């Protein structure tokens, strides 16, 4: 409907796949080459389904900060026959607050879904499902089961992936340029 939705749509149309694990279907952001991200609670194994294609996982790394605190981001390298458009130049370099974000989701359950979530707070620490988690972004939208892995964007930046909610707020894990060097 406006430039925020335009940037979000451009990311969804070229840089997302539907990932299926034993824990469900997730929006999965492709970042560059065969490298993608997914919430760590997706529990990626040796095999994953990508757009319903059986795919070998070549590497998977559950990220933690240098305090050895969960970040809730898993970086996956996929044995896929095609590269993603390189979007690393849209990743923030530092932890920040944002205005006017969109959360975008694409699954069997929620196709072509775009939510204007508004102002995004650098929340920091969250006890996420009982797990101490750092680098959390917070927005005041009542997100639901099925939106995990959803992409959080502003005009010109890909800032996070949706990892949870409390019924009134939603929470995303930061994406930082330094994760994908």
Swiss-Prot record:
Residues the record marks as active site: 41 (for protease 3c activity), 72 (for protease 3c activity), 148 (for protease 3c activity)
Residue ranges of domain Peptidase C3 in the record: 2-180
UniProt catalytic activity: Selective cleavage of Gln-|-Gly bond in the poliovirus polyprotein. In other picornavirus reactions Glu may be substituted for Gln, and Ser or Thr for Gly
Subcellular location: Host cytoplasm
Role, per record: Major viral protease that mediates proteolytic processing of the polyprotein. Cleaves host EIF5B, contributing to host translation shutoff. Also cleaves host PABPC1, contributing to host translation shutoff. Binds and inhibits host IFIH1/MDA5, thereby inhibiting the type-I IFN production and the establishment of the antiviral state. Cleaves host MAP3K7/TAK1, resulting in inhibition of TRAF6-triggered NF-kappa-B induction. Cleaves host TICAM1; this interaction allows the virus to disrupt host TLR3 signaling. Cleaves host IRF7, resulting in inhibition of type-I IFN production.
Subunit structure: Interacts with host IFIH1/MDA5; this interaction inhibits host IFIH1.
Protein name: Protease 3C
Source organism (scientific name): Human enterovirus D68
Full protein segment contained here: 1549 to 1728 of 2188
